[PDB]
PDB file of C-alpha atoms in Angstrom:
ATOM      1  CA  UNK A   1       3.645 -37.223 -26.466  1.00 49.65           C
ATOM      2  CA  UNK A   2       4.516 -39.362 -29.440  1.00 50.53           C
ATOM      3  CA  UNK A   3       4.590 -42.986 -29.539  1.00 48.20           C
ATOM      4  CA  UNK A   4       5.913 -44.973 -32.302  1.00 48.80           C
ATOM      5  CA  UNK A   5       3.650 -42.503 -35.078  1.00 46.21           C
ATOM      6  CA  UNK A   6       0.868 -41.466 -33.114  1.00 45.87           C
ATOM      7  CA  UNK A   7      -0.140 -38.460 -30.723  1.00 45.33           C
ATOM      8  CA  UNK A   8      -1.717 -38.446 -27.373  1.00 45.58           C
ATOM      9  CA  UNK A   9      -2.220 -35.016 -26.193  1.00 48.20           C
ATOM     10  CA  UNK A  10      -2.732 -34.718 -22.123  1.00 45.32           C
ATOM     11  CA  UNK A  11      -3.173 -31.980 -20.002  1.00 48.02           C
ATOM     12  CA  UNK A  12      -1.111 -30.485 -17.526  1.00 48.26           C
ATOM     13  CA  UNK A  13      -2.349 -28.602 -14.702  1.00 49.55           C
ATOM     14  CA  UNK A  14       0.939 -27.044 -13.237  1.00 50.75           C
ATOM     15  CA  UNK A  15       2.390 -25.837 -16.468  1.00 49.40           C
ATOM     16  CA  UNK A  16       1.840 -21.937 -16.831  1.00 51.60           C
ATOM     17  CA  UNK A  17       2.346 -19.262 -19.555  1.00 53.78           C
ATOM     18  CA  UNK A  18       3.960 -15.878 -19.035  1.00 57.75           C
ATOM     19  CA  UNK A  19       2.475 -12.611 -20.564  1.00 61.03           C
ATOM     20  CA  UNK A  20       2.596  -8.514 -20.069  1.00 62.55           C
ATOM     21  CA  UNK A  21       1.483  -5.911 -22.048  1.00 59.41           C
ATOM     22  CA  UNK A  22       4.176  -3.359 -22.999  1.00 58.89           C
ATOM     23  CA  UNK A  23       2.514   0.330 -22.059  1.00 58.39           C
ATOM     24  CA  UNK A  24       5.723   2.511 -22.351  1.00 58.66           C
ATOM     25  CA  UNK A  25       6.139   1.371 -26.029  1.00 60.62           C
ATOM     26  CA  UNK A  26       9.715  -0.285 -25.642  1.00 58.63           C
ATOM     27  CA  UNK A  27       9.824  -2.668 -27.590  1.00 57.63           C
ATOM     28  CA  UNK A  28       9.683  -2.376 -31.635  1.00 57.71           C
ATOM     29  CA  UNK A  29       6.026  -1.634 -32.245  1.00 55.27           C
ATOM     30  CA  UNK A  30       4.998  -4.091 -35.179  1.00 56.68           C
ATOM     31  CA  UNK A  31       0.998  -3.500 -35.382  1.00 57.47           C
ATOM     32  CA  UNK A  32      -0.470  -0.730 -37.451  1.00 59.23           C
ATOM     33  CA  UNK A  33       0.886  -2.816 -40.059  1.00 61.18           C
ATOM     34  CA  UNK A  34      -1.429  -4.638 -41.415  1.00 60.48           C
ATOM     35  CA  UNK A  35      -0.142  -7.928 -40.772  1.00 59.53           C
ATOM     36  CA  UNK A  36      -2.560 -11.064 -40.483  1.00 60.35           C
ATOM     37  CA  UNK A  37      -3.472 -13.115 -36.883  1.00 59.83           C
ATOM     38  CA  UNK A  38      -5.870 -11.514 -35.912  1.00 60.75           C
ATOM     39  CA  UNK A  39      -9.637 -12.333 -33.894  1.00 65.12           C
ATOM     40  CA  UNK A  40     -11.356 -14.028 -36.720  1.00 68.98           C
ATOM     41  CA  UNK A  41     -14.428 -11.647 -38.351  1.00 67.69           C
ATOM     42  CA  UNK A  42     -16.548 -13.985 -36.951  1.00 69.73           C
ATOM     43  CA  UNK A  43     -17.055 -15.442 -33.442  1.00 71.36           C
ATOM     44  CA  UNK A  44     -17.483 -19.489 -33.872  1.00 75.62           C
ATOM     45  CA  UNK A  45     -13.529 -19.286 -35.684  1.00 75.57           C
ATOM     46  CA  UNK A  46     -10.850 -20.523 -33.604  1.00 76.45           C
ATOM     47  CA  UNK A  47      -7.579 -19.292 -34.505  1.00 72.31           C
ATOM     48  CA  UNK A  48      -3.769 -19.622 -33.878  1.00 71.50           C
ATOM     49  CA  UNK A  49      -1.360 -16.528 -32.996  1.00 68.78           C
ATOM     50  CA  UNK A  50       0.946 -15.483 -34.950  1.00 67.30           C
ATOM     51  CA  UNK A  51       4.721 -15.166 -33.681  1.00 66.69           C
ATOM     52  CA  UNK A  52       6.493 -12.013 -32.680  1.00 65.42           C
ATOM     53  CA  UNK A  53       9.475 -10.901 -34.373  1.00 64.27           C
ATOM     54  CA  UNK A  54      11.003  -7.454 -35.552  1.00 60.76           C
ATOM     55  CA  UNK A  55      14.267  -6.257 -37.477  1.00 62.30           C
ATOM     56  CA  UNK A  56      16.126  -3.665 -37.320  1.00 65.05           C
ATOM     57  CA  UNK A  57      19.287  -1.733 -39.085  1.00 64.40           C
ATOM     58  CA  UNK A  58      21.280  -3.802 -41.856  1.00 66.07           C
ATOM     59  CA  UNK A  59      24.455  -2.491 -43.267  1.00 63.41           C
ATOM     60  CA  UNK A  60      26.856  -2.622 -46.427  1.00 64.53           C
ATOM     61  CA  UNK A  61      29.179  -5.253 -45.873  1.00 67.39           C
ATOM     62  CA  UNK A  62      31.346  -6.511 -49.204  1.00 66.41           C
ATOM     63  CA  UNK A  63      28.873  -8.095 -51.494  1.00 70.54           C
ATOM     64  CA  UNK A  64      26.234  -8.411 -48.516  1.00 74.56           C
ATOM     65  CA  UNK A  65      23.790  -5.039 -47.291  1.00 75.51           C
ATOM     66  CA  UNK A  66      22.463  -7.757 -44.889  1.00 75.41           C
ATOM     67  CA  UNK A  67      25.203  -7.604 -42.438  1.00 75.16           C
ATOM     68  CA  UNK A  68      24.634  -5.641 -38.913  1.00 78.04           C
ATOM     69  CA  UNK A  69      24.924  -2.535 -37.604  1.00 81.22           C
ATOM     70  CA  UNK A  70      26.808  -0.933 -34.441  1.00 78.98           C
ATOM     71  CA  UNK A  71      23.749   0.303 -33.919  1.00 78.52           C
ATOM     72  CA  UNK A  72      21.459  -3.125 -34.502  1.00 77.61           C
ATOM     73  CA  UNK A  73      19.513  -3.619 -31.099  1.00 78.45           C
ATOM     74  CA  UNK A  74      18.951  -6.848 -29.650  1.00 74.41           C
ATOM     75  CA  UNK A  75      15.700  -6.966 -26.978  1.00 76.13           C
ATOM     76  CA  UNK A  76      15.141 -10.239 -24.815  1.00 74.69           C
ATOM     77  CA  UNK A  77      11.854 -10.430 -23.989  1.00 74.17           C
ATOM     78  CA  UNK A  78      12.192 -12.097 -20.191  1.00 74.03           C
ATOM     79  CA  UNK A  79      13.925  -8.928 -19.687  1.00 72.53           C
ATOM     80  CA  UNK A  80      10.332  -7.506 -19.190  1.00 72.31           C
ATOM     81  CA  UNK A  81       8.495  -8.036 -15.700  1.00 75.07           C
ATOM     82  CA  UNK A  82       5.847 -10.401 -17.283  1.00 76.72           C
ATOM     83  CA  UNK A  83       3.057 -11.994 -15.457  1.00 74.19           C
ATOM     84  CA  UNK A  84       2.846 -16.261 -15.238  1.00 73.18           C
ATOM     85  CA  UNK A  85      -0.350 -17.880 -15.140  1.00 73.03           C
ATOM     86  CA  UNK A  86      -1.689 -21.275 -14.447  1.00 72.21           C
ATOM     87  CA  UNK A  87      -5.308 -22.518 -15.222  1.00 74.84           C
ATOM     88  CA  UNK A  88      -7.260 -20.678 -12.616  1.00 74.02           C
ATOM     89  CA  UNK A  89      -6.069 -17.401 -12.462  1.00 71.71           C
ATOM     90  CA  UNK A  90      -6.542 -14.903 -15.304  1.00 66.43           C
ATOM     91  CA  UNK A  91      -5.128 -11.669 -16.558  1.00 65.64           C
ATOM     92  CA  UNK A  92      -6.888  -7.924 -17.414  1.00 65.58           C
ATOM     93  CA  UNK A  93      -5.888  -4.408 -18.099  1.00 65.68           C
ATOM     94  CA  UNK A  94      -7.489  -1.048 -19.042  1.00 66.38           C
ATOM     95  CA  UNK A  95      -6.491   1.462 -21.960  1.00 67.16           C
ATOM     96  CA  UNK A  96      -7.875   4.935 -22.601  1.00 64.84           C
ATOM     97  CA  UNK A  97      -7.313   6.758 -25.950  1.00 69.20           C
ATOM     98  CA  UNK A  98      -5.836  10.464 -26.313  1.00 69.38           C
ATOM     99  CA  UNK A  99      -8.538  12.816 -27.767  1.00 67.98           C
ATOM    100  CA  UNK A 100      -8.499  12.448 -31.768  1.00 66.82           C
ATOM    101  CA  UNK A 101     -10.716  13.549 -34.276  1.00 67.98           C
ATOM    102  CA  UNK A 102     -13.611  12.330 -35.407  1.00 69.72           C
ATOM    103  CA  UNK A 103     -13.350  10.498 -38.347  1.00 67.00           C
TER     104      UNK A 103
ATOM    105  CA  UNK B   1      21.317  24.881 -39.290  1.00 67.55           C
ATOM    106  CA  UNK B   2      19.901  22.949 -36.357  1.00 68.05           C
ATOM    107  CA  UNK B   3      18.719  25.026 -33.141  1.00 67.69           C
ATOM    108  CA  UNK B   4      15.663  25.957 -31.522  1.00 66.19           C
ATOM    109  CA  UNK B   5      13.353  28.251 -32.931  1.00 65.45           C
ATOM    110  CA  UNK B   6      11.779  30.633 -30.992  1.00 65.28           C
ATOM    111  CA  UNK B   7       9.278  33.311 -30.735  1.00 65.15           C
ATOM    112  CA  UNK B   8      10.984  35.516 -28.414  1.00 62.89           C
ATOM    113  CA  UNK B   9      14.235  35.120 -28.320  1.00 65.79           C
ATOM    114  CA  UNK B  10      16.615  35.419 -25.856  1.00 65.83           C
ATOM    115  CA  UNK B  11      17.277  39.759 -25.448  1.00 63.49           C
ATOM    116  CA  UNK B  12      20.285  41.181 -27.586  1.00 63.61           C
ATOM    117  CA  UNK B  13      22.485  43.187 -25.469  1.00 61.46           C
ATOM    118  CA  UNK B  14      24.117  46.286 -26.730  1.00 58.41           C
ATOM    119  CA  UNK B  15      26.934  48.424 -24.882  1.00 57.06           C
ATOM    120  CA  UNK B  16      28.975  51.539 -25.984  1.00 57.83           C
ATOM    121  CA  UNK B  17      31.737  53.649 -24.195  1.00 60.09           C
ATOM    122  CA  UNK B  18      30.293  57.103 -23.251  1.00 63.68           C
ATOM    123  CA  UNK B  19      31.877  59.850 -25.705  1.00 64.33           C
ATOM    124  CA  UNK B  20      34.000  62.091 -23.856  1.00 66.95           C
ATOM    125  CA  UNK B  21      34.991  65.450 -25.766  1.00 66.60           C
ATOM    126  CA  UNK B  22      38.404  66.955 -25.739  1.00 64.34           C
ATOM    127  CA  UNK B  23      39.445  70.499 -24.917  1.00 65.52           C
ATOM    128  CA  UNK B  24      36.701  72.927 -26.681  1.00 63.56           C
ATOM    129  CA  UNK B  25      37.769  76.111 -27.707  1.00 61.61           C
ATOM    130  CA  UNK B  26      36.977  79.436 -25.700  1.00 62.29           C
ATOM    131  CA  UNK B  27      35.231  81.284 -28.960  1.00 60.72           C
ATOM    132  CA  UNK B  28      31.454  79.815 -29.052  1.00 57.24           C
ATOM    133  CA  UNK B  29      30.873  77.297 -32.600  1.00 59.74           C
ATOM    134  CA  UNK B  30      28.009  75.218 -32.860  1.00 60.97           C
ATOM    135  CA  UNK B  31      29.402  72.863 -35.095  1.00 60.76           C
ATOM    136  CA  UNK B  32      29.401  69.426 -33.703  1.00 60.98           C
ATOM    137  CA  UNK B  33      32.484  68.256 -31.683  1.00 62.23           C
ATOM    138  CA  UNK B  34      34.794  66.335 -33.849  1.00 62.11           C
ATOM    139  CA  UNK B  35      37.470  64.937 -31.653  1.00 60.70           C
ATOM    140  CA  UNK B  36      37.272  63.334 -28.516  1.00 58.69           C
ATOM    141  CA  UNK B  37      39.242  61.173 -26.128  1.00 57.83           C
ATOM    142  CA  UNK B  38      40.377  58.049 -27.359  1.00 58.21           C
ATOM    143  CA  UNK B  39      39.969  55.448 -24.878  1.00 61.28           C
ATOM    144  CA  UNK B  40      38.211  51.651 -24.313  1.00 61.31           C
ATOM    145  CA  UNK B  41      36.737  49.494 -21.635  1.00 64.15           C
ATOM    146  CA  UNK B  42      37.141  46.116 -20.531  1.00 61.13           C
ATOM    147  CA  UNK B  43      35.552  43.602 -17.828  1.00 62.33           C
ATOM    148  CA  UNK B  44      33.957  40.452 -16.846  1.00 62.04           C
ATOM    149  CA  UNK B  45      30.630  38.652 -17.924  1.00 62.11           C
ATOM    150  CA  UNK B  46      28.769  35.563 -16.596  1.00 63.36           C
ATOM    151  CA  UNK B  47      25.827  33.394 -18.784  1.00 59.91           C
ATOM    152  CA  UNK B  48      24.343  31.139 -16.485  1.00 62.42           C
ATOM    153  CA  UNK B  49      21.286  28.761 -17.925  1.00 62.11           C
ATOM    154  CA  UNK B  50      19.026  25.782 -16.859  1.00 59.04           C
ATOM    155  CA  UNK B  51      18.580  23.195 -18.924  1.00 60.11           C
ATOM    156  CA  UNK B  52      16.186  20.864 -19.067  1.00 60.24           C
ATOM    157  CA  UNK B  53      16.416  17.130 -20.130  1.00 62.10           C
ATOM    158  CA  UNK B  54      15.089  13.848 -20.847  1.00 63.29           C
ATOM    159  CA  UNK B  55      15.639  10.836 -18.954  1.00 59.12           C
ATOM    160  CA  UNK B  56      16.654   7.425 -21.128  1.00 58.99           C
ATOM    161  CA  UNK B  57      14.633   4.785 -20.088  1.00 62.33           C
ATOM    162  CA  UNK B  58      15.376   1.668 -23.071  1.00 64.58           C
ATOM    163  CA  UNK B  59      15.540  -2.498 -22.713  1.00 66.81           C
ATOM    164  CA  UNK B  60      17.624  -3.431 -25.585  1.00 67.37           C
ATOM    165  CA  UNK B  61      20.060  -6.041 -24.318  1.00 68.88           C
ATOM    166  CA  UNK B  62      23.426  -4.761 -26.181  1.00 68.43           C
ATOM    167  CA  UNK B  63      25.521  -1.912 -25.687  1.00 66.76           C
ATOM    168  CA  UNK B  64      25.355   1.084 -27.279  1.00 65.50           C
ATOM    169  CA  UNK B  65      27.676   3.211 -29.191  1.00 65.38           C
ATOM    170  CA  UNK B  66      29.195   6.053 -27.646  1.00 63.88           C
ATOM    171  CA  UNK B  67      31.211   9.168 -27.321  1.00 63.42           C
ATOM    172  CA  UNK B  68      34.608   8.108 -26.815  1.00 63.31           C
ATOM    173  CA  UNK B  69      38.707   9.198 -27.526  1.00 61.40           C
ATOM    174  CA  UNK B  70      40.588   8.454 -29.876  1.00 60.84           C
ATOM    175  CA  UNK B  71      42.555   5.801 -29.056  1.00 58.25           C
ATOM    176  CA  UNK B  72      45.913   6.631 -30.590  1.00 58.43           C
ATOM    177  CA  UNK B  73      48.958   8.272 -28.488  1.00 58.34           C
ATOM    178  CA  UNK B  74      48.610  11.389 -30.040  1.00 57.60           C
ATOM    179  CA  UNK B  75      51.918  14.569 -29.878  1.00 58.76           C
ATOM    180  CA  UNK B  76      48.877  16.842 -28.290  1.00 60.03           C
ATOM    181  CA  UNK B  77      45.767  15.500 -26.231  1.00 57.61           C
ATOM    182  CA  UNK B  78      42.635  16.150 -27.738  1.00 59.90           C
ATOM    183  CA  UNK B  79      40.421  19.276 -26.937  1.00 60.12           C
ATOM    184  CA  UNK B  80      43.705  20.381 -25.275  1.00 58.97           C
ATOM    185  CA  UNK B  81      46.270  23.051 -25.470  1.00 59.10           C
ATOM    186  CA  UNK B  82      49.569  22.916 -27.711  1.00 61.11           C
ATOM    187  CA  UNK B  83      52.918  23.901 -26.920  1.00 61.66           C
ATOM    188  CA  UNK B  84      52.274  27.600 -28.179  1.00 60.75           C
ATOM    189  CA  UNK B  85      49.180  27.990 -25.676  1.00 59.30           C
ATOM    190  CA  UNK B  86      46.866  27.579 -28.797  1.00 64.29           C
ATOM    191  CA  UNK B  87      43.309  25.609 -27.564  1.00 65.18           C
ATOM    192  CA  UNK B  88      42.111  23.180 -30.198  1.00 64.51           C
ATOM    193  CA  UNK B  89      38.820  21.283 -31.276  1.00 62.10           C
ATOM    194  CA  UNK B  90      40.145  18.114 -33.007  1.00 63.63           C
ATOM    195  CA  UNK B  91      36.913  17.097 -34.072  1.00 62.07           C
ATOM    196  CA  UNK B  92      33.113  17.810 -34.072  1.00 60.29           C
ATOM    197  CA  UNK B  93      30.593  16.271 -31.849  1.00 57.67           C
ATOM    198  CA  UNK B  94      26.837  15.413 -32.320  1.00 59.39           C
ATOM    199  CA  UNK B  95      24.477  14.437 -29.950  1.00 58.54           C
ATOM    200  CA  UNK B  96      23.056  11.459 -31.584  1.00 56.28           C
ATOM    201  CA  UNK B  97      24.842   7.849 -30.455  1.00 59.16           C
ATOM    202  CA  UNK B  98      21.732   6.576 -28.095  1.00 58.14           C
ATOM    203  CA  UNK B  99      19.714   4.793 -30.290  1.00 56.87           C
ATOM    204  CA  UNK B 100      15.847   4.523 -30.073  1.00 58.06           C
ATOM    205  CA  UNK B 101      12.825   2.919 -31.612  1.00 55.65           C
ATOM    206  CA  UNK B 102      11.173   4.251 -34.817  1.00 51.80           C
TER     207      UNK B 102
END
Protein backbone atom coordinates (compact mmCIF):
# COMPACT_ATOMS: atom_id res chain seq x y z
CA UNK A 1 0.00 0.00 0.00
CA UNK A 2 1.23 3.45 -0.89
CA UNK A 3 0.64 6.49 0.98
CA UNK A 4 1.44 9.86 -0.20
CA UNK A 5 5.39 8.44 -1.37
CA UNK A 6 5.97 5.78 0.92
CA UNK A 7 5.41 1.85 1.15
CA UNK A 8 4.01 -0.25 3.86
CA UNK A 9 4.06 -3.78 2.92
CA UNK A 10 1.49 -6.12 5.11
CA UNK A 11 0.70 -9.52 4.96
CA UNK A 12 -2.23 -11.28 3.97
CA UNK A 13 -3.15 -14.56 5.17
CA UNK A 14 -6.13 -15.51 2.81
CA UNK A 15 -4.54 -14.51 -0.42
CA UNK A 16 -3.25 -17.71 -2.35
CA UNK A 17 -1.15 -18.46 -5.49
CA UNK A 18 -2.03 -20.98 -8.17
CA UNK A 19 0.62 -23.40 -9.69
CA UNK A 20 0.87 -26.97 -11.76
CA UNK A 21 3.49 -28.51 -13.40
CA UNK A 22 2.83 -29.31 -17.08
CA UNK A 23 3.86 -33.31 -17.50
CA UNK A 24 2.32 -33.96 -21.01
CA UNK A 25 4.53 -31.14 -22.48
CA UNK A 26 1.59 -28.85 -23.82
CA UNK A 27 2.54 -25.93 -23.56
CA UNK A 28 5.63 -24.29 -25.61
CA UNK A 29 8.63 -25.75 -23.83
CA UNK A 30 11.04 -22.66 -23.24
CA UNK A 31 13.94 -24.31 -20.95
CA UNK A 32 16.89 -26.06 -22.47
CA UNK A 33 17.54 -22.68 -23.55
CA UNK A 34 19.75 -21.26 -21.65
CA UNK A 35 17.88 -18.46 -20.42
CA UNK A 36 18.74 -16.78 -16.93
CA UNK A 37 16.38 -17.09 -13.42
CA UNK A 38 17.53 -19.62 -12.18
CA UNK A 39 18.42 -21.09 -8.18
CA UNK A 40 21.34 -18.89 -7.48
CA UNK A 41 24.96 -21.04 -7.50
CA UNK A 42 24.96 -20.45 -4.10
CA UNK A 43 22.49 -21.08 -1.23
CA UNK A 44 22.41 -17.68 1.05
CA UNK A 45 21.14 -15.75 -2.64
CA UNK A 46 17.64 -14.88 -2.76
CA UNK A 47 16.33 -14.44 -6.09
CA UNK A 48 13.29 -13.27 -8.19
CA UNK A 49 11.57 -15.47 -11.08
CA UNK A 50 11.64 -14.68 -14.18
CA UNK A 51 8.26 -14.36 -16.29
CA UNK A 52 6.89 -16.87 -18.71
CA UNK A 53 6.33 -16.04 -22.18
CA UNK A 54 6.76 -17.84 -25.67
CA UNK A 55 6.19 -16.88 -29.49
CA UNK A 56 5.28 -18.50 -32.08
CA UNK A 57 4.80 -18.26 -36.15
CA UNK A 58 5.15 -14.62 -37.74
CA UNK A 59 4.29 -14.03 -41.31
CA UNK A 60 4.98 -11.66 -44.43
CA UNK A 61 2.59 -9.04 -44.30
CA UNK A 62 3.37 -5.74 -46.73
CA UNK A 63 6.41 -4.12 -45.31
CA UNK A 64 5.94 -6.11 -41.88
CA UNK A 65 7.23 -10.23 -41.45
CA UNK A 66 5.91 -9.55 -37.89
CA UNK A 67 2.33 -9.98 -38.63
CA UNK A 68 0.47 -13.45 -37.57
CA UNK A 69 -0.16 -16.54 -38.81
CA UNK A 70 -3.44 -18.77 -39.41
CA UNK A 71 -1.59 -20.99 -37.75
CA UNK A 72 -0.22 -18.61 -34.61
CA UNK A 73 -1.49 -20.44 -31.35
CA UNK A 74 -2.72 -18.65 -28.49
CA UNK A 75 -2.53 -20.84 -24.91
CA UNK A 76 -4.29 -19.36 -21.68
CA UNK A 77 -2.74 -20.62 -18.94
CA UNK A 78 -6.01 -20.95 -16.39
CA UNK A 79 -7.00 -23.25 -19.04
CA UNK A 80 -4.73 -25.79 -17.13
CA UNK A 81 -6.15 -27.59 -13.88
CA UNK A 82 -3.64 -25.72 -11.57
CA UNK A 83 -3.38 -26.15 -7.91
CA UNK A 84 -4.12 -22.82 -5.33
CA UNK A 85 -2.35 -22.54 -2.24
CA UNK A 86 -2.53 -20.50 0.86
CA UNK A 87 0.22 -20.24 3.62
CA UNK A 88 -0.07 -23.60 5.22
CA UNK A 89 -0.42 -26.00 2.71
CA UNK A 90 2.38 -26.85 0.27
CA UNK A 91 2.90 -28.47 -3.07
CA UNK A 92 5.33 -31.69 -4.33
CA UNK A 93 5.76 -33.94 -7.26
CA UNK A 94 8.07 -36.75 -8.47
CA UNK A 95 9.96 -37.12 -11.95
CA UNK A 96 11.93 -40.10 -13.22
CA UNK A 97 14.30 -39.83 -16.24
CA UNK A 98 14.21 -42.24 -19.44
CA UNK A 99 17.46 -44.33 -19.60
CA UNK A 100 20.29 -42.11 -21.39
CA UNK A 101 23.78 -42.52 -21.72
CA UNK A 102 26.32 -41.89 -19.65
CA UNK A 103 27.98 -38.90 -20.28
CA UNK B 1 8.08 -39.40 -52.12
CA UNK B 2 6.56 -39.65 -48.66
CA UNK B 3 5.35 -43.26 -47.40
CA UNK B 4 6.36 -45.75 -45.04
CA UNK B 5 9.30 -47.69 -45.41
CA UNK B 6 9.33 -51.06 -44.68
CA UNK B 7 11.26 -54.17 -44.31
CA UNK B 8 8.80 -56.55 -45.53
CA UNK B 9 6.51 -55.25 -47.48
CA UNK B 10 3.19 -55.92 -48.04
CA UNK B 11 3.18 -59.48 -50.65
CA UNK B 12 2.98 -58.68 -54.52
CA UNK B 13 0.32 -60.65 -56.06
CA UNK B 14 0.68 -62.08 -59.48
CA UNK B 15 -2.18 -63.84 -61.65
CA UNK B 16 -2.21 -65.23 -65.27
CA UNK B 17 -4.99 -66.95 -67.41
CA UNK B 18 -4.14 -70.69 -67.85
CA UNK B 19 -2.93 -71.29 -71.63
CA UNK B 20 -5.31 -73.34 -73.38
CA UNK B 21 -4.01 -74.88 -76.82
CA UNK B 22 -6.04 -75.06 -79.94
CA UNK B 23 -6.74 -78.04 -82.18
CA UNK B 24 -3.22 -80.06 -82.50
CA UNK B 25 -2.65 -81.85 -85.47
CA UNK B 26 -3.02 -85.78 -85.75
CA UNK B 27 0.82 -86.30 -87.17
CA UNK B 28 3.15 -86.24 -83.85
CA UNK B 29 5.70 -82.66 -83.84
CA UNK B 30 7.44 -81.73 -80.89
CA UNK B 31 7.74 -78.29 -81.65
CA UNK B 32 6.15 -76.13 -79.10
CA UNK B 33 2.44 -75.16 -79.56
CA UNK B 34 2.16 -71.83 -81.15
CA UNK B 35 -1.45 -70.88 -81.12
CA UNK B 36 -3.88 -71.12 -78.57
CA UNK B 37 -7.29 -69.86 -77.56
CA UNK B 38 -7.67 -66.35 -77.24
CA UNK B 39 -9.65 -65.52 -74.32
CA UNK B 40 -9.53 -63.22 -70.78
CA UNK B 41 -10.87 -63.18 -67.29
CA UNK B 42 -12.51 -60.81 -65.18
CA UNK B 43 -13.85 -60.52 -61.40
CA UNK B 44 -14.04 -58.90 -58.12
CA UNK B 45 -11.35 -57.95 -55.41
CA UNK B 46 -11.60 -56.63 -51.81
CA UNK B 47 -8.42 -54.73 -49.71
CA UNK B 48 -9.49 -54.44 -46.35
CA UNK B 49 -6.82 -52.76 -43.68
CA UNK B 50 -6.60 -51.52 -40.00
CA UNK B 51 -5.23 -48.56 -39.31
CA UNK B 52 -3.93 -47.32 -36.49
CA UNK B 53 -3.94 -43.68 -35.13
CA UNK B 54 -3.09 -41.05 -32.80
CA UNK B 55 -5.34 -39.31 -30.60
CA UNK B 56 -5.00 -35.15 -30.50
CA UNK B 57 -4.86 -34.11 -27.18
CA UNK B 58 -3.71 -29.90 -27.46
CA UNK B 59 -4.78 -26.59 -25.13
CA UNK B 60 -4.22 -23.81 -27.45
CA UNK B 61 -7.20 -21.50 -27.06
CA UNK B 62 -7.86 -20.61 -30.96
CA UNK B 63 -9.13 -22.53 -33.69
CA UNK B 64 -7.36 -24.29 -35.99
CA UNK B 65 -7.15 -24.40 -39.67
CA UNK B 66 -8.80 -26.99 -41.49
CA UNK B 67 -9.85 -29.07 -44.39
CA UNK B 68 -12.65 -27.38 -45.87
CA UNK B 69 -14.67 -26.65 -49.60
CA UNK B 70 -14.33 -24.33 -51.63
CA UNK B 71 -16.68 -21.92 -51.12
CA UNK B 72 -17.65 -20.82 -54.60
CA UNK B 73 -20.93 -22.21 -56.53
CA UNK B 74 -19.04 -24.15 -58.75
CA UNK B 75 -20.82 -25.80 -62.65
CA UNK B 76 -19.58 -29.38 -61.04
CA UNK B 77 -19.24 -30.23 -57.19
CA UNK B 78 -15.95 -31.03 -56.15
CA UNK B 79 -14.54 -34.67 -55.96
CA UNK B 80 -17.75 -35.34 -57.97
CA UNK B 81 -18.86 -36.64 -61.26
CA UNK B 82 -19.43 -34.43 -64.53
CA UNK B 83 -22.07 -34.56 -66.95
CA UNK B 84 -20.10 -37.20 -69.15
CA UNK B 85 -19.80 -39.69 -66.03
CA UNK B 86 -16.06 -38.59 -65.77
CA UNK B 87 -14.93 -38.67 -61.67
CA UNK B 88 -12.63 -35.80 -60.83
CA UNK B 89 -9.98 -34.76 -58.10
CA UNK B 90 -10.13 -30.92 -58.13
CA UNK B 91 -7.38 -30.59 -55.90
CA UNK B 92 -4.74 -32.37 -53.71
CA UNK B 93 -4.95 -32.95 -50.07
CA UNK B 94 -2.25 -33.20 -47.28
CA UNK B 95 -2.58 -34.26 -43.98
CA UNK B 96 -0.95 -31.49 -42.20
CA UNK B 97 -3.56 -28.50 -40.89
CA UNK B 98 -3.44 -29.55 -36.92
CA UNK B 99 -0.80 -27.67 -35.66
CA UNK B 100 1.57 -28.77 -32.78
CA UNK B 101 4.42 -27.66 -30.61
CA UNK B 102 8.08 -27.75 -31.80
Amino acid sequence: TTTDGTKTIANNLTSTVQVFADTEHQLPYILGSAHEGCMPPFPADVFMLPQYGYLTLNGPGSNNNNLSTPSSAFYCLEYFPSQMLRTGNNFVFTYEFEKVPFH
Amino acid sequence: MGGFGLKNPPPQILIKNTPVPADPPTQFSSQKINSFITQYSTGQMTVEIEWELRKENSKRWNPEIQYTANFNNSANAQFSVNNNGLYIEDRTIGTRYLTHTL
